[PDB]
């Protein structure tokens, strides 16, 4: 999946 | 509710909360926190931050549950959608509260470029997140709200901040995801994640041991979603 | 969630929220299959016991790191005191209604001994995560209480099932959970728990290749108890 | 801390 800054 | 209780006790709680791993309650003490009309410090931004991101989080990934679910249909009951349903308007009201909150209490003109980079990402960020479940001409109103958002907080940053600030960097990483999942247009994504990743690389060596470990942490996520994009 | 929803569809909608990891939703849809009046399936059972296992579950989770802070302070201001008795009020709701659609619903005069001891093991637990959190005469009744059900519910289990049967160890285990924190009797639950698993380990050789994993897991938390305690 | 039937 994309990674956000979410995704530590 | 909130209005009766101080502001540091509101943050106490909020910090009691997340030990509880209690985000709702977590978010409605910010929510007050921020309702008292003081500006947020740094950390109070994050607790913020961090206690929405996980209501949010958690709706999203039941979304996407349910939806590759409902999109199963033919490669049937009216359950899958209508329960769909039911999380989405919850999602949509909690992106709805913090954008409220954001244009109520917490964009400004005044303050560092630091805050107002923080609270503009985050404005874009919860207008994807609500792009993600909208359709139609709601939808197009909705890209464009994270479009000038990402846009303006991008401005912000490339003026008053350094290449490797982290803040920076996140608002990067998220503006190339919204090129890539939102906007789907995978040139610029890939574009604005290799310009940041390449144009902080190469000013890794002036940083202290602690600045170094917040930017490779975040270029590194530039990096898994290059590898997969390209 | 509601009386204007199919029996057969809020079946279906708890699956999908547990799926989706949402339990509160889950538990949701099954208290309205509860209140349709028909009774549950073996299956159905479990998914009422998940819900609201995991619902309370991150209530006691968050109530005894609180209790802990606030002790620990014990030896300042009320934030940790004022925020963990609105965890605590939200937990007892929660509990209440469990038992209330216990008494309401499932506890019936005569049914199978399976789905009796289900709802009796069901009906002591949850006295039991009330007694945790109670202080005086109403403590003393709620102990009661959750004694009564886990032994009527024991009786059961020792006339109408086998030593190795899944759900008569469950009960068992933990009812020697209840001699042991909240009946202060740590005589009685080590015993309990001993002969519990000796007679289950007296007739393994007489279970099938699937169950046995049933059975052991059981067996296994007896023993770790058992370590703990002694 | 004791274990019950939730941590099967």
Same mark, same amino acid.
């Given at each position: 999946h994309s990674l956000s800054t979410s995704d530590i | 509710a909130m209005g009766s209780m101080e502001r540091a006790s509101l943050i106490q709680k909020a910090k009691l909360a997340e030990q509880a791993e209690r985000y709702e309650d977590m978010a409605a003490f910010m929510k007050g926190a921020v309702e008292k009309g003081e500006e947020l410090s740094c950390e109070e931004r994050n607790l913020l931050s961090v206690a929405y991101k996980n209501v949010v989080g958690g709706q999203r990934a039941a979304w996407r549950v349910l939806s590759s679910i409902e999109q199963k249909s033919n490669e049937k009951g009216?359950?899958?959608?209508?329960?769909?349903? =039911?999380?989405?308007?919850?999602?949509? *009201?909690?992106?709805?509260?913090?954008?409220?909150?954001?244009?109520?209490?917490?964009? =400004?003109?005044? *303050?560092?470029?630091?805050?107002?980079?923080?609270?503009? =990402?985050? =404005? *874009?960020?919860?207008?994807?997140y609500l792009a993600e479940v909208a359709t139609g001409d709601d939808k197009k109103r909705i890209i464009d709200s994270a479009r000038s958002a990402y846009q303006e907080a991008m401005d912000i940053s490339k003026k008053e901040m350094p290449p490797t600030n982290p803040i920076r960097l996140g608002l990067a990483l998220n503006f190339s995801v919204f090129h890539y999942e939102i906007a789907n247009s995978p040139e610029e994504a890939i574009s604005l994640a290799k310009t940041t990743f390449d144009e902080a690389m190469a000013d890794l060596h002036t940083l202290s041991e602690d600045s170094y470990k917040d930017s490779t942490l975040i270029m590194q996520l530039l990096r898994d979603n290059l590898t997969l994009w390209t």
């Open positions: - | 009216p359950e899958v959608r209508e329960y769909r349903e =039911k999380v989405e308007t919850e999602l949509q *009201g909690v992106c709805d509260t913090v954008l409220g909150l954001l244009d109520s209490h917490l964009i =400004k003109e005044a *303050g560092d470029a630091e805050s107002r980079v923080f609270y503009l =990402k985050m =404005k *874009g960020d919860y207008y994807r």
